[PDB]
Amino acid sequence: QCPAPPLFPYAKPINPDESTFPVGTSLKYECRPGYIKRQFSITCEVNSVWTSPQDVCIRKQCETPLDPQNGIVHVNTDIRFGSSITYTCNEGYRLIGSSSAMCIISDQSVAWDAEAPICESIPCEIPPSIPNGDFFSPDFHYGMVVTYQCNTDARGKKLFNLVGEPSIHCTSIDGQVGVWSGPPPQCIELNKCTPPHVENAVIVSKNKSLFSLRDMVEFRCQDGFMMKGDSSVYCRSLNRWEPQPSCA
Numbered sequence: 151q152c153p154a155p156p157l158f159p160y161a162k163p164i165n166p167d168e169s170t171f172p173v174g175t176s177l178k179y180e181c182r183p184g185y186i187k188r189q190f191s192i193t194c195e196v197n198s199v200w201t202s203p204q205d206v207c208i209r210k211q212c213e214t215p216l217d218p219q220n221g222i223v224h225v226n227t228d229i230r231f232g233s234s235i236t237y238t239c240n241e242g243y244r245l246i247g248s249s250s251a252m253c254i255i256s257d258q259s260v261a262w263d264a265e266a267p268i269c270e271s272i273p274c275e276i277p278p279s280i281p282n283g284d285f286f287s288p289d290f291h292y293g294m295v296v297t298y299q300c301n302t303d304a305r306g307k308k309l310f311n312l313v314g315e316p317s318i319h320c321t322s323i324d325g326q327v328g329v330w331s332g333p334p335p336q337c338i339e340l341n342k343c344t345p346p347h348v349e350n351a352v353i354v355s356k357n358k359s360l361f362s363l364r365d366m367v368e369f370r371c372q373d374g375f376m377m378k379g380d381s382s383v384y385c386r387s388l389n390r391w392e393p394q395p396s397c398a
Contacts, residue, residue: 152194160185160207173198181207184231184255210260212253221245221269229253231260239269242292244326246270274320274328282310282337292328295319300337310337311389313344343385350375350397361385371397 152171155163164178171177175194181187185207192202209230215223220243227233234252239245247267254263274290285296297317300310314335321331338344343361346353348369355368365385371377379395386392 151198152200153198155192155200156202158202161190161202164189184210184260186210212260212262215251215262215266218266218269220271221267223266231255235262237267237269239267239325241325242272242322243269244272272320272322272326272328274330277318277330278334280334280337283312283335285334290320290328292320292322298335309340311340311342312336313338313389338389340387343389343391346383346391348395348397351395363387367391369395 151173152175154169155171155177158179160182161179162182164180171194173194173196176191177193178189179192179202180189186209188206190203190206192200195201209232211230212233213229215225215229215235217223218237218239221237221239224236224238225233226236229235231253234250236250237245238249245267246269248264249267251262251264251266253260271291274292274294276290277285277296280298283298283300285298287294287296290296295317296319298312299316300308300312303309312335315332316335318334319331320328322328336344338360341363343363343365345358345361346367350372351369352372353367354370355366358365361367363385366382367384368382369377370381375397377395378398380393381395383391383393383395
């Protein structure tokens with residue numbers, strides 16, 4: 151009075167074709183590849199329904215995954231047959247290798263179909279060379295800082311004004327390519343001024359790549375705003391402008 155047995159995703163019959171079994175019939179089943187090896191029986195009970203033993207087939211375990219150095223392993227389900235793991239690298243590190251692995255049948259057991267990846271520090275190009283100066287460094291990777299310094303004269307006395315941020319650091323925008331945080335500073339002669347900047351204004355006087363002491367600069371505010379302060383300023387020592395205007 152029993153119908154054909156259920157068709158288990160984890161088990162198969164040891165000796166496979168029929169559609170009618172009397173009550174009390176026992177059939178010999180086997181756990182499929184990737185499950186811990188076991189032979190068992192399914193029985194046709196008095197009410198014409200089949201019963202199999204509890205937790206008969208357990209999925210085989212793959213080796214314990216570890217977090218890469220400077221990275222993390224993500225176990226989304228478990229570390230058994232059919233499951234997958236993904237890897238990510240931490241901030242300032244980039245992945246080399248496979249970003250995922252799956253627990254698959256390997257010979258007479260189970261194994262990860264890929265090796266764990268490396269999370270290496272994002273590298274940087276040598277920082278820029280600047281005329282009349284250089285950077286101090288103890289090979290550049292994410293986070294490293296470099297400070298620039300102007301050359302002194304042959305007697306160790308100040309010869310240039312260091313203009314801008316003296317320090318820059320290796321960073322990244324995409325998490326793959328390393329970029330320096332900003333531009334390097336400049337080493338300007340003591341009787342010179344660098345071109346001045348006023349937001350939402352243009353220079354109407356002669357533009358210069360570099361200005362000399364007492365040189366004048368005239369600014370014009372763009373259409374929409376206008377002068378606050380004097381429009382004319384003059385080059386002072388130590389890269390200063392006297393007086394120091396605005397466009398609001």
